[PDB]
Design a protein around this ligand. Structure first.
Ligand SMILES: [Hg+2]
Ligand SMILES: [Hg+2]
Ligand SMILES: [Hg+2]
Ligand SMILES: [Hg+2]
Ligand SMILES: [Hg+2]
Ligand SMILES: [Hg+2]
Ligand SMILES: [Hg+2]
Ligand SMILES: [Hg+2]
Lengths: 173, 173, 173, 173
């Protein structure tokens, strides 16, 4: 993509994470590393982690990414809306996939209990290896969309159904 | 769908229900009880009732619909597949709403938490004051789909969010 | 829905057609019957037919539907938006299906050449019998949708592919 | 998709092309460079070009890529199927855009009329300034899908509606 926004999406542990701003940041709780007193090479005390369930924000004071504009980031997405989820993979394939946003709810996905905003993939249903649906490793991916005026992030890729038809994204609200 | 299949959706309560077999009848739990004694004109003590949450099955002792054939009642729709929620509106009308079935969940729909298999409707943003979604009073309508050559049932309509699109199907489990 | 909107969807020859206004009415050209006279009990000159393509309007002096407040009658709809088909059928089944809309080519869907604007149904890739798809008899049926807190008509059903995936919207030129 | 499938997609003309096998190579037409006595360095005269409208196949004399193996090239894919366009950027980046396949058609995307198998892309609902969809130089890329356990090629990227999701694939047909 000519990338102001795929490449704000970066690898972060077992998963991914997103730069909504040079100051702000989004990523999925279960994805964060254990082992540590430091991330984006910064003093772990310096920043305001404001973690919520399976969502987790980072409020930075710094040039971290002086290369990014800052993004609007709303509570959830209204139900109905078709957001996109920005997935990077290993051959670093960039796989945006339309997600038709659902309700907020808790759920039984891959045994676990996930609270976040549900949604269904437009690539119909089935995934077998890497192309039409989501994988274990995509957590952290953002769920962006474009309002009238600007882009907005709505959440992070938190989890998915065995067939990959339904996904849940960790949110703010 | 066919006449003989709508034959089996009957009013029941503040709601509706479904004749899966001659002896078996399915409906949504929140409409049935009121505080009672007997159903379909028969003794409660002569029915085996099975409540799994929002779902409820009655298995009677005598054939209350000998005209019916006997359906399969799977235990939930398989994620991915698209069912037809068989609504009878009390106004002579039939509205066989299409839905993609998602994961099991629990939303917080108006005043209360509901559990069951969630799902997206296949219509725009559905609910509206008046629109093309489920309206209060539809609960208990079956969710049926044609597997092979056969027509089957997964569950019944328990609830649906207010911004439309989302619905919940109660299921045997 | 309750029929106030479905009330503008009356039967019409081969097919259907749609009261947009009381003065006004849309339908697919191929469905208009073998040449006659008088329609909706008015006669030809009352009426100024100003049909063009497979789209056909009818304007009259006589408020034929006064109960109805004419709607905005746009040409197509932008790409993406999902509009609602509003299929009235043989059994009095209302069947609103959703269509993420597309460009306006000329495809050839059956062994006939159909110009209008394409769309895909959200129910899928499989409409085998009574399913979640359009049918031969549906032509005429309206595509509707909410633009502001207002209801715009975008077109009528011209054709569909053997699988139901892809359908064509006849538009006013 | 795997990396041996992407090692197939090379730049060509003003767009790109696909190595179906060692011999055979495929691309859309309007990207073929204009005047010239040879390509992929072997001499024109020894190549068998088959042009089928927007689609063009070059069968070579000698294995020009013995590193790979030869795959199935169907006549286009089937409607409703979801394929992936193996879109390469000139910057390195790999972007397999998901699309759902529809009718053959013909539309005038900008300057002229393109005919091919139309499709709808599955990422939010559009492309822009910089996005989720095609860019003018992407013509030529393949549209693959996995059949049993193997990958097949159903056609090449011929064009796309500006501000939109619609896409046109050139095919054998
Ligand atoms: Hg979103
Ligand atoms: Hg989201
Ligand atoms: Hg079902
Ligand atoms: Hg179900
Ligand atoms: Hg439309
Ligand atoms: Hg339309
Ligand atoms: Hg394909
Ligand atoms: Hg194709």
């Amino acid at each position: 993509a000519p990338p102001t926004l795929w490449s704000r999406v970066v690898r972060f542990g077992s998963g991914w994470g997103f730069w909504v701003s040079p100051t702000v940041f989004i990523t999925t709780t279960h994805v964060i590393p254990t082992g540590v007193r430091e991330f984006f090479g910064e003093p772990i005390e310096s920043i305001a982690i404001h973690r919520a369930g399976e969502f987790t924000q980072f409020r930075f004071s710094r040039k971290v990414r002086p290369d990014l504009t800052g993004m609007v980031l709303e509570e959830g997405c209204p139900e109905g809306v078709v957001c996109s989820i920005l997935i990077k993979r290993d051959s670093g394939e960039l796989l945006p996939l339309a997600v038709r946003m659902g309700a907020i709810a808790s759920m039984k996905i891959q045994g676990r209990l996930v609270h976040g905003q549900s949604g269904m993939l437009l690539t119909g249903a089935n995934a077998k290896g890497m192309d039409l649906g989501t994988l274990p490793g995509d957590c952290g991916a953002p769920y962006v969309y474009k309002r009238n005026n600007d882009w907005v992030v709505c959440g992070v890729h938190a989890a998915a159904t065995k067939s990959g038809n339904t996904v849940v994204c960790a949110v703010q609200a």
